[PDB]
Amino acid sequence: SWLLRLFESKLFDISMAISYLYNSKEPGVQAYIGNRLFCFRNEDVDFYLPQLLNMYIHMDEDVGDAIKPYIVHRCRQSINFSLQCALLLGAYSSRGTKLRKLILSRLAPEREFIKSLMAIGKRLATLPTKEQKTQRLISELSLLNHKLPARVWLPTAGFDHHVVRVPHTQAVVLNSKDKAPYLIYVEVLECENFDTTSVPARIPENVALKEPWQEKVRRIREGSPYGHLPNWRLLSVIVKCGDDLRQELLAFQVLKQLQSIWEQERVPLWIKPYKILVISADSGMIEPVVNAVSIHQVKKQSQLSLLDYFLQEHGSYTTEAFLSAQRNFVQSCAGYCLVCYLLQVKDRHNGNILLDAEGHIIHIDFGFILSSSFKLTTEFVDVMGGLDGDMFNYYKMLMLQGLIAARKHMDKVVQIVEIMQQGSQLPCFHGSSTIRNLKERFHMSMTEEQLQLLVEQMVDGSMRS
């Protein structure tokens, strides 16, 4: 009764459920939890959808069959949910096909919307320069508009909605590479429920520059047919036609968990998970951070040192705007340092770190992590006021605090990674001890005095270059 006792206690959450489901070989428990999934709030379970669906594919039939009923139920009340299921099912197997086909068995409007977006991206491959790609993109996006408002939506969107219009002139391509990703803006009309609501009606059609996000909404709004409606909102996604995002998704979950952990404890670290949408093992979409640009390009347009740019855009070190910006910098540095260490994130450079208008940094390219094979440069230390600085001392204090916090919730993190490794051919699971090494990196055995030293050691390492 002691097991059943626990499961009926307050202690029972979606996390625990998945853990037992993943580990327990008892079919009575597996089936029991499969049923208990229904009692939880939709939102809590949603976060673990990639794990659940992964289990279904790669685990014993017993395990799948316990999961399926809940899945089908959700699939039946939400096509969005249906969509994300179908997309994930396909991407994670290269058993799967049967449930996928059953769910797709309807979604054609959306699937064609997504197909076209992917199709667009692949054509730009023949155009060897960034600037050339953009013009081909803009024209062909205009053709989408010809497709009417289509009762299709961006799953990457926080809410249910219909897409009405694509402001093609505002879209831009981000690099000159062979399979370059591209950023687009999308107009949508918010819903109360997608599943019950008429696709909006077409409204007949009668310049792009570096600007803040809200100014861009202004500019786009004034020109748009649909802009007058209160229902109207502007979304944005990056389209990656030839890059795998399954590792990207995994990092997202880890970032999201770590964010909650530091949130649950009261450690004011700052980080920013950006939404991921897996479409295939080939292709995906990303919800971009607005009001942000790369440090590298920040340095090429400003001609300044990182500290100098801060001073320009916010004010001198005696101003609030600066001290606020410095503070946001320091908290975001400690956060991402910790993320980089724990996940062993590599290929870290100023091309991969964004700076937002409030002073936070944001890491972005989560290739090269874990088994697959962070820097405190003086430019960064300067913004912090230097090594002897109080704000710098504060940076070290947060890392220890954030480490102590992480240790208190290690299992939630490892779970995400450890499940994902399942039947996986991803480079991040290449080692024999990926999860084993990961656990070692939390240093659960260490005393706080020991951790202070380890934190110190970490910082010293980050400076050598």
Binding site: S1, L3, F7, V29, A31, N35, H73
Partner: protein, 162 residues
């Protein structure tokens, strides 16, 4: 006073041993050590003013000790596992090969608590139930629901063979 022998048969996993532990020791467990070979267990109740004692048989290859001296037999299936209901037909050909031709049968759907995972509707079962010569009920072994009821039902029904 009196002595009523009842057997439990059905597919593996359907919940016989916990039916037995609920009914006879009022105990349940999610973690499970397999029954090796055979058990009975006993508890006495009263029906129609008379003190009775019930003998329940918990089932490898079916030796014919089972189905020996059974006035009644509870044939149990898991509502949440359709196959177990499907095999109720094969469990009755067995039972006619190895058991008394005037024996009391209750069809039992166990694990009624798994509402959202239900794979066998009560109506389909009860249709088959009264379509045939079996008595019918749904129980849940995990929570103490209808476990007592089930026995007391079959036991009351039995003494009526005066």
């Amino acid at each position: 006073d009196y002595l009523f022998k009842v057997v439990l048969i059905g597919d593996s996993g359907v919940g016989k041993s916990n039916l037995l532990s609920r009914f006879t020791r009022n105990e349940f467990n999610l973690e499970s050590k397999s029954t090796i070979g055979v058990e009975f267990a006993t508890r006495s109740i009263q029906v129609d003013g008379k003190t009775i004692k019930a003998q329940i048989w918990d089932t490898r290859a079916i030796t014919s000790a089972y189905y020996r001296g059974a006035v009644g037999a509870l044939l149990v299936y898991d509502i949440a596992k359709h196959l177990t209901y499907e095999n109720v037909e094969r469990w009755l050909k067995e039972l006619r090969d190895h058991a008394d031709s005037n024996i009391v049968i209750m069809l039992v759907g166990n694990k009624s608590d798994l509402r959202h995972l239900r794979a066998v509707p009560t109506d389909e079962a009860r249709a088959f139930a009264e379509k045939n010569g079996l008595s019918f009920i749904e129980t849940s072994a995990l929570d103490s629901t209808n476990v007592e009821a089930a026995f007391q039902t079959i036991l009351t029904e039995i003494y009526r063979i005066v």
